Amino acid sequence: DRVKRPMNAFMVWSRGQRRKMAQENPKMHNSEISKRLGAEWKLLSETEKRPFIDEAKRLRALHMKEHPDYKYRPRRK
Amino acid sequence: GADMKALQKELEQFAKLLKQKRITLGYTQADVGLTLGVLFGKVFSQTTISRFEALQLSLKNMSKLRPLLEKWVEEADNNENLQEISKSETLVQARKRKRTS
DNA sequence: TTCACTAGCATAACAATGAGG
DNA sequence: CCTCATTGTTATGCTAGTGAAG
């Protein structure tokens, strides 16, 4: 029941893609999956990244709408 | 500053209003820093913006940046209204072109 | 060659996801 | 529980640089 921090544009796009990639070839560890996902994202153009960036913006806005008193609180090492 | 109590109360509620507006407009803290630097000629790091939003800055610095942020939010809201009107206009234009095609 | 503050520069934490230590 | 692996947003620990007092 703890509030999690909102996900940026990458996390949105990666969450979409890694489910498809796991259904595509199972028995593949998310480490190589995330390496490949980041490598692919680095090659996208701004025209291609636009909708996910806008989705992350909408997500943060809706997060503040839901939790007006949220504060990200990490635990430093 | 008449007294630090009422002034700091007003300032700490203004900080929450500033965060709320920057979130509903889609700016990251680094984005606000970059835009402040570009329209006022003085760079502002994301660090100072986080500290402002956490009221972790000297009251003199809080009040020194408050007018800067007010001008910034005026310009940002103008830009947002402009983009919104332009998007709806282009949508009506696309309706016209598609129905008339 | 002392203490208090100031402002970045860096980098950790953490969001998702699940397999396998 | 935990570690991994990824990019992006946010909080903050460590500096170099600045005065002030003695």
DSSP sequence for B61-92: HHHHHHHHHHHHHHHHHHHHHHHHHHHHHHHH
Q: Which residues of B touch A54 (CB under 8 A)?
A: 26
Q: At what angle do helices B29-40 and B59-100 cross, to 10 degrees?
A: 100
**Domains parsed from chain B with CATH numbers:** 1-101 (1.10.260.40)
Answer whether CATH 1.10.30.10 is correct for domain A1-77: yes
- Dist. CA B34–CA B44, nearest whole Å: 7
Nearest to B12 by CA among B47, B63, B70, B67: B63
Distances, alpha carbon A28 to alpha carbons A20, A23, A76, B23, B83, in Å: 12, 10, 32, 37, 44
- Dist. CA B64–CA B54, nearest whole Å: 16
Domain boundaries, chain A: 1-77
Query: What residue type is assigned to position B83 of the chain?
Result: Q
Resolution in angstrom units:
3.5
Q: Which helix (H) or strand (E) holds B56?
A: none
Q: How far is CA B84 from the centre of its chain?
A: 17
Evaluate if the CB of A36 falls below 7 Å from strand C. no
Q: Which residues of A touch B24 (CB under 8 A)?
A: 61, 64
Annotated binding site of B for DNA: 22, 29
Angle at B29 between CA B81 and CA A64, to 5 degrees: 70
Query: What residue type is assigned to position A13 of the chain?
Result: W
Q: Which helix (H) or strand (E) holds B53?
A: helix B46-53
Angle at A56 between CA A45 and CA B87, to 5 degrees: 70
- Dist. CA B30–CA B40, nearest whole Å: 15
